[PDB]
Amino acid sequence: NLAPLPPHVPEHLVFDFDMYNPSNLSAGVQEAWAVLQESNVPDLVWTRCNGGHWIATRGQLIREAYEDYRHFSSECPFIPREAGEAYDFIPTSMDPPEQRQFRALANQVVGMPVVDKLENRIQELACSLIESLRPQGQCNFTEDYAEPFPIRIFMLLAGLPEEDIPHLKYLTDQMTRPDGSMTFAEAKEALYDYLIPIIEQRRQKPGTDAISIVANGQVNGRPITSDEAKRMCGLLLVGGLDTVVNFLSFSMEFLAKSPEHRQELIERPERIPAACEELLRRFSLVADGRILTSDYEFHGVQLKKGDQILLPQMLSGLDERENAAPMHVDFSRQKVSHTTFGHGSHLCLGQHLARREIIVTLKEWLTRIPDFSIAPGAQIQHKSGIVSGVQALPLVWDPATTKA
Ligand code: HEM
Ligand SMILES: CN(C)c1cccc2c(S(=O)(=O)NCCCCCCCCNC(=O)C[C@]34C[C@H]5C[C@H](C[C@H](C5)C3)C4)cccc12
Numbered sequence: 374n375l376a377p378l379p380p381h382v383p384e385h386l387v388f389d390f391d392m393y394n395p396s397n398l399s400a401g402v403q404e405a406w407a408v409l410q411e412s413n414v415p416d417l418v419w420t421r422c423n424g425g426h427w428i429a430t431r432g433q434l435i436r437e438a439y440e441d442y443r444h445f446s447s448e449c450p451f452i453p454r455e456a457g458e459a460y461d462f463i464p465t466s467m468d469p470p471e472q473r474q475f476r477a478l479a480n481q482v483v484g485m486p487v488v489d490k491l492e493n494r495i496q497e498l499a500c501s502l503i504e505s506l507r508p509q510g511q512c513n514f515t516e517d518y519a520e521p522f523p524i525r526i527f528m529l530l531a532g533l534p535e536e537d538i539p540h541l542k543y544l545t546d547q548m549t550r551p552d553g554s555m556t557f558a559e560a561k562e563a564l565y566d567y568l569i570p571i572i573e574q575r576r577q578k579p580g581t582d583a584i585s586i587v588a589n590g591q592v593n594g595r596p597i598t599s600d601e602a603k604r605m606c607g608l609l610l611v612g613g614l615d616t617v618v619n620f621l622s623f624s625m626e627f628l629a630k631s632p633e634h635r636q637e638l639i640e641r642p643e644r645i646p647a648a649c650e651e652l653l654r655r656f657s658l659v660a661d662g663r664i665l666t667s668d669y670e671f672h673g674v675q676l677k678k679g680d681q682i683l684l685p686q687m688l689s690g691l692d693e694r695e696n697a698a699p700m701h702v703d704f705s706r707q708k709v710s711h712t713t714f715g716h717g718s719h720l721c722l723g724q725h726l727a728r729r730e731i732i733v734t735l736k737e738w739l740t741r742i743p744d745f746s747i748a749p750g751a752q753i754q755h756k757s758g759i760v761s762g763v764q765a766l767p768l769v770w771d772p773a774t775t776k777a
């Protein structure tokens with residue numbers, strides 16, 4: 374189904390890109406999205422897919438719309454509209470100025486000083502996961518390392534016992550990949566049923582952990598409500614799962630297919646933090662958006678109040694106006710330009726934790742299993758959406774080349 378073209382939208386801007394099923398998916402998802410940056414494609418287009426919505430295709434427009442929250446509201450941040458409308462996590466669905474207090478609170482639980490403190494526990498977890506795969510000589514990376522890793526980091530952050538992982542993983546999977554057992558709202562409520570009691574207890578007997586902090590917090594000079602804490606705790610849980618899982622998978626897929634890039638990192642592990650940044654550009658993967666708060670002319674184009682606009686974080690760093698030869702991976706780029714963690718008032722609060730997860734993973738993997746490949750015969754499949762990703766990543770190695 375295409376949606377019929379709204380009258381304010383001129384025909385010459387219409388490019389029916391489908392964000393959940395792009396034409397060139399088989400060639401790689403970032404590549405599939407990069408067709409939007411071909412020379413015949415305007416900086417701002419309308420697609421009739423997925424209810425109909427604008428797409429900003431260039432880093433300059435993407436950044437500008439993200440800065441201008443007065444015209445581009447996060448009240449409805451997801452395409453299609455029905456998803457955007459039912460979405461209530463905090464702070465992702467709030468605009469400044471209200472979002473500012475909630476964000477400061479959330480920053481207390483995942484900000485830089487928390488990350489510096491957790492780094493060693495993160496390394497311990499990574500090492501334990503890798504060392505259990507190492508002798509096998511094979512894994513599905515996405516399933517065997519990537520999925521268990523960030524959920525375990527959330528348990529450590531939130532002071533939750535490891536016993537709860539299976540149930541928690543199931544509920545978050547249902548929100549982003551439903552098997553049918555539960556609607557989004559049922560999964561959401563089950564999450565709330567899970568967090569509500571721990572919130573009440575940690576209100577009464579505080580810990581030094583994320584759930585305590587968010588529960589004992591103050592916003593707008595008053596105590597955070599139970600509805601507000603659970604909706605924040607919800608985002609803190611889901612925000613760092615699918616992004617980390619899929620990003621780690623794009624990265625490992627690249628390194629498996631590029632011996633020369635692996636060898637560089639093996640020989641110069643000091644370049645790993647830079648390599649992380651360049652991978653974050655090349656394999657950027659989020660595409661959310663905004664809704665117009667009013668009629669607005671933006672870069673020659675008449676936008677109407679209530680129109681949705683997709684602003685793909687993914688596209689800014691792939692824009693050849695931002696980075697020369699954008700599909701080329703070069704770990705020594707002088708200026709790595711990207712909006713992989715967003716831009717503007719909602720810039721990812723988990724970005725410092727994500728970078729440490731990524732760096733620790735690459736450092737620990739490359740020192741234990743320096744030599745690996747894509748399993749003989751396998752063709753890696755990508756998926757496209759709000760968070761794009763990797764269906765599966767079967768890796769192989771010779772265990773004699775590994776270090777215990
Ligand atoms: C590769 C990993 C990650 C990527 C690419 C990523 C990406 C993003 C992006 C693009 C936004 C802005 C969304 C918007 O403007 O609508 C965002 C916000 C956010 N992220 Fe991440 N993220 C990652 C990891 C994490 C982690 C590990 C956490 C920890 C829980 C986290 C927590 C959050 C929170 C709480 C917000 C909302 C900030 C606000 O609305 O004020 N993220 N993220
Ligand atoms: C028929 N019709 C109209 C339809 C009906 C229903 C579904 C449809 C789908 S669809 O099934 O493919 N729709 C996708 C469901 C929306 C996913 C919700 C996001 C959850 C992750 N949330 C975060 O808050 C984390 C986080 C974390 C960070 C920051 C920010 C953005 C990203 C990255 C995610 C928040 C496709 C096409 C049509 C559909």
Ligand SMILES: [K+]
Nearest residue numbers: 448457458460
């Ligand atoms: K909403």
